[PDB]
Amino acid sequence: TYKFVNMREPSMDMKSVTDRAAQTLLWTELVRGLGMTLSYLFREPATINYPFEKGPLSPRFRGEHALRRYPSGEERCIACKLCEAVCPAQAITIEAEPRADGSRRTTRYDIDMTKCIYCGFCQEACPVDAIVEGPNFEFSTETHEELLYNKEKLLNNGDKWEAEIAANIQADYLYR
Amino acid sequence: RGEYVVAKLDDLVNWARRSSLWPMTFGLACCAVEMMHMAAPRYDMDRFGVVFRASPRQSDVMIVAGTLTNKMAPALRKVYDQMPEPRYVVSMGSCANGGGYYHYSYSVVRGCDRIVPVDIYVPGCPPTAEALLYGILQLQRKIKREKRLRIWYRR
Amino acid sequence: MWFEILPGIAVMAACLFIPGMATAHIHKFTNGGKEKRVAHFSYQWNLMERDRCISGVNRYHVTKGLENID
Amino acid sequence: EDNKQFFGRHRWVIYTTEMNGRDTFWDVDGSMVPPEWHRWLHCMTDDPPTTKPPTARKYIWTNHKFNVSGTPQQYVPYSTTRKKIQEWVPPSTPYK
Amino acid sequence: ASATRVIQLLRNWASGRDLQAKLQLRYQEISKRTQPPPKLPVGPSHKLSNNYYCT
Amino acid sequence: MFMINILSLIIPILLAVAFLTLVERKVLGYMQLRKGPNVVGPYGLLQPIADALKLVTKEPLRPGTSSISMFIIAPILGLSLALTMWVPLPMPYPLINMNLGVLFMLAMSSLAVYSILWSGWASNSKYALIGALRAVAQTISYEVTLAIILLSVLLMNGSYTLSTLITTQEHIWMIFTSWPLAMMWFISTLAETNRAPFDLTEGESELVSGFNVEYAAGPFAMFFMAEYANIIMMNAFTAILFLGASHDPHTPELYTINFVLKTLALTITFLWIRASYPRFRYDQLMHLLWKSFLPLTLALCMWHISLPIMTASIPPQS
Amino acid sequence: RKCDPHIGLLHRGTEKLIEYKTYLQALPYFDRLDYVSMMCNEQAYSLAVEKLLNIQPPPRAQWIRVLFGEITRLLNHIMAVTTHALDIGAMTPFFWMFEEREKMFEFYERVSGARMHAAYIRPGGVHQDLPLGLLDDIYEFSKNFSFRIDELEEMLTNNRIWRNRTVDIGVVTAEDALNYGFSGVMLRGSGIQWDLRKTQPYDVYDQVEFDVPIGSRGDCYDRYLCRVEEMRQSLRIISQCLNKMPPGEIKVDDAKVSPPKRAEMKTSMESLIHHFKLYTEGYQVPPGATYTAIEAPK
């Protein structure tokens, strides 16, 4: 089906042309605009008071990455090396090494924030939910260097936002 | 003494400079529409005291927002050049930060800082509107911690 | 809401308020309470010059009438 | 919190005056919000930690910190691996 | 919503329509952000009877 | 004490202009459902101060291909003329009671175009050059209607003395007699003052910043101050002309209340228009003026010259 | 006389790196290609890729795609109209609609987890389910948006300044428009009787009714009426998809092209291998070629 959008039939009776002349002479349609915006002013605004109040978000939010650890506290990461293999920007660099215990985890988990694109594929890639990416978005900076996150930086951030992301995946893993 | 007087004078200039900057968003890519989104009534930069001003001879801070290519490279620098002092550039998004998703392609310079002296790096792909709003807030905090008149006093 | 713009325009009303009040009161104050006797035509001007000379003090605005004649 | 206000401004904050040994009466940042309360403030969950305390862990940061960029306790990247090619140690004492 | 009937009348008359019926903002009508856990379905070929991938 | 009165007139207007940026920013934002400046001080009250002293502390870069003497004279003429616009206003009792104030009003307003022409030429850039040329072209097209409207409007007043307008409107607003001219005069004031839809002079979207495309920092405020000062004065001029007020000699306070309250209403509807209409175009800008405005102004002028004769209602020249 | 649209000031590798990224890795490129129509791009990629794989997504997946596809159509048409009004002058319809634009942007966040680059439409369906109650909020949004369209038309449609800057401007005849390779609204504005969603209904678009807004002049004004009518017809799709959202799975029941469920990942060995090789090697698409075409809002 379809419908026309500009087939207009201006009736040429003496009545109708009076409105058309009234429209042109007295700026009726322009006055419609004035009363239109006036009604908008007489309405409330919707400007949220940042940072005293921020935008509404969702448990599935993708933000800043943070490596987590088990309830025991050992790092979930086992260097399966899936995340960099799917990482569409190759922002994840990592090299595994033997460990003293034999639970040979990685000596390197460096995610370049200025190369990464926050698809969240790393979360889906990780079979042990080691690399998740938290709800934080305030991690701005002034020098390009501090965005080259390293294994220590992710571990510290994971220990920081651990209170938040733990509940987020708690309320979202059923969907995943 | 003179230190106290110059401290007040520096603060007086400081307060306006951190509350009257007029950004010029050099709209490049999907990062740019987000900056128009934080022009929406939801965030409304202008409530802070900043207005989207063209003619970059009027603007104070200029925002690269999106990927930057070699074709865009020389003109973008010139925008920075005749941009009057004080001038600050904020890196919007991963692509402007460090090339981002196209960091390896043949046509985009990896990172915008290779062309201009980036002041604030804002991560994101795209950075959510209020994340940039946070970055602008960081700009004023950094603007608050300057010693222009103080340095001249010891100069 | 829109009660937040009234502080802006109320100051505005005060700004345009001042020039009207000043020129009204200075005219009143300088010209002994009365307004500035305007002379759009030469008749009104030579009316004033008569007043300035007739006041005995060389100001037109000083008005002095029936107390003089005898 | 005020449910009568529209979505967004319905719950909000005024920040503290002392944050980790830093004056913050005039300045305002969004990052001093602790993680467990960051969940509730962004409407990611409409029930505050006062009624649903976050699960306690030995490693969870006891003191939340704001952004540290531009400050002496900044972050600085550094290679976390170990140097692999080591030089031939030059022996000492004799000659021929 | 907050807004008194006086300037509600001003919005309604100037706009030529009633705006209290529907507003561009949100209110209590929004589903609360603690929705119960789901029970997402299983695949059509999730049966453990004849399910050979040769089909 | 004539001097202190002068500063009592120019100083408040400059502070009024500064605060005009704040209210316009907030009101325009409110149409767009925004909030406008409310962080810098209570309800953005110190935003004009913040904007003013930030730009002053920004270097006034002169373009390489600029005549510095030519670059500087234009703001001086622009700002001084705008402040001089108020000296014959019938504010309680007019400051400069020029018997031909309306002619003095028109001559100074028409002399403002030299700032537009000189700024464009001194900048010496194609974008600024054609921006200025069309700017004056829009400018010079409309004041002929301004003169015709005033001649028809002032015809039933009695003379060109601005103070006489008060006694003419002693009973009813003068808009009722010439409301076709009132909208005629009002629209032409936007074109002179260069607000949307008549913003093609500046054209923020499509002419970058018009003649202010380069003009920065120090003397840029002068055009901005002169522009916004004209907004009040043109609205104030319209307020006295058509929306007259009663003036008790023993209480000039009262008529100031009426005059002031009207002139913010007239300025408010200015940016109210800006927040509702698309920007015009150069050809429509001329076509609207020369094809549908000039003929109507002529006929209405013809109607208003003969009207006092056919009704024996000619006004006294005094 | 002549205008040269010198473009390339944004030319990235795009297709060049796609030769080096796997199908899954290449998916986020389309989100960034026509960046204002987020899902409509990856809709084309998933339709293209699943066509080669000879695998059709479950009906539940299809209905989510079209719902977000038309929601994305609301995204872009608001962009196209408001941004145009910015430069023509009047800038308040910009902000008025952008308040709404956040609401569906918020909806994007509720499902995918990101604001713009959702990366939701994957080959074989969609990545995740809608959160519980998500359809309710978009239903509340759908009710109020018809009013917001009325704000645009009342603001602009009858305004003389809007019309005269737009009517009888940039008109193109049907033959040249088709010969120029134009598409979508560009042809429809000139009265050309064509629409991909109708003539070649991909996905669920056959099981839905909507009126294509064919213009009758070909000038800019005709398209503007066509676009705002496309808004209303898009709102028709939201309602029809809302009342007819079927149950079922989110992705195809073929782990060789669809990563297994996280629960099945950690209990079933076949899932681990299938998840492993999919995120490192990726599914192998059979050789061949295909030009799959969908009607983006552009």
Ligand SMILES: CCCCCCCCCCCCCCCCCC(=O)OC[C@H](COP(=O)([O-])OCC[N+](C)(C)C)OC(=O)CCCCCCCCCCCCCCCCC
């Ligand atoms: C005995 C009676 C004697 C008198 C009788 C007089 C005739 C009856 C009254 C006629 C109407 C009044 C005179 C004409 C007015 C219109 C002139 C004209 O050209 O109109 C058509 C014109 C042109 O319309 P157009 O361009 O669409 O069509 C004109 C005709 N063609 C196409 C052939 C060119 O309208 C405009 O110019 C529109 C407005 C442009 C400016 C934008 C801002 C408008 C703001 C409006 C709101 C604010 C109003 C404030 C009013 C004052 C407040 C103090």
Ligand code: SF4
């Ligand atoms: S979201 Fe994860 S997988 Fe995707 S680019 Fe970023 S680090 Fe790599």
Ligand code: SF4
């Ligand atoms: S973080 Fe997860 S996906 Fe990445 S290497 Fe470690 S275990 Fe593998």
Ligand code: SF4
């Ligand atoms: S950083 Fe991401 S969102 Fe920003 S321009 Fe690059 S790809 Fe687009």
